[model samples]
Target: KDVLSAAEVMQWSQSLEKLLANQTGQNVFGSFLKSEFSEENIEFWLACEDYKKTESDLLPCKAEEIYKAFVHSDAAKQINIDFRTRESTAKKIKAPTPTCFDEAQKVIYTLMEKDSYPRFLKSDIYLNLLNDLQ
Candidate 1:
């Protein structure tokens, strides 16, 4: 188990919202997700974050990559998105925009925050960090 500082443990324990807000914390949580085969969620979220910052003219290409990798039903690495979001995403892919994935991204965020985040807190990886911090 990797040792974390008291401050680091506190930041991580506060929950996903706080952890993700910090790059180091995000990386730590992402590492945990990777070990669990759920890294796709964070990858999708990060892709969305990057997608939102892309230039308008470049949105089409980036949007397509994000969709095919994490949204499309037959995507190489699809996430668990709802029918409505998938439908809207597929529709927007033809003429992608900055906000094309806004709704779907929100859904993914909630999914991770509610589902994966809790498990992460209880995982041996997290417990070890907490123990090491003390």
Candidate 2:
């Protein structure tokens, strides 16, 4: 297996989050939490320098935040309509402004710091979540 760089894995995981979330019509991390996890999938989600340091769990808070950001963004509008058929209630959201991309980034970093996940794969809760897929 080709070892992906942190950035590479992050980008892939992020995009995969969006794509799969769209297709599954559910939150990316949320769906992942429900699925059966395999060693390969776990390693893929924990695609970081010391990902092995982490314990296998179904609920990864950090990964959820990244997904939360994507779902809150304008891109989510498309994903919701095209994929999830979700309403545009995001426009009415007040506290977490969608215009501030930095805020979302902060959410990501904050969750990462909390979870001790590296800069990458901090939002990948799929691998370690569960064995439902099996």
Candidate 3:
């Protein structure tokens, strides 16, 4: 099976190229998220990515859906976010904008970068995958 080497996986830190290059990378990352009890983080990212592609007329509805699921208080799958960001998002929902989730998205991206991304580099799952690939 074709897969990245240990060195190549390490290089993912420098650039997301290796991780985003193939389905294996995506699956590995998704499993990593599940292991960390933060599958919703990837879910939120995917939802936001989809939200970006939504038609202008449907943007408000979709934005509200995302907020209720990921931003609102005691949401079914609420993401960890700061008070100000949540408050701002609440306000934005009154008149939703295309970039309504921009701030929240940046927050989650930073969380993954500073938190999960590092652990992923050192994780056995990644190393095992690399070993299997060889």
On TM-score, the leading prediction is 1
Which regions of candidate 1 are displaced past 4 Å? 1-4
Q: For residues 21-86, write the lDDT of model 2, one tens digit per residue.
A: 232222343344334231222222332212224344512433334334344445331122222212
Q: Would you estimate the TM-scores of all the predictions?
A: 0.89, 0.21, 0.84
- lDDT against the true structure, per candidate, is 0.85, 0.33, 0.80
> Model 1 over residues 83-126: C-alpha lDDT tens digits?
98889889999998788988988998999999889888888877
Candidate 1 vs candidate 2: the TM-score winner is 1
* Displacement of the residue 34 alpha carbon in candidate 1, Å: 1.6
State each candidate's clash count: 0, 6, 0
Candidate 3 local lDDT, 1-134, one digit each (tens)? 94456666655656444565556676788799898888777779778888988999998899989988988997877898899998998899878877888899889877877788778877998777667755
Worst 10 residues of 1 by lDDT: 2-11
Using TM-score as the yardstick, the better of models 2 and 3 is 3
* Superposed Cα deviation of residue 113, candidate 2 (Å): 1.4
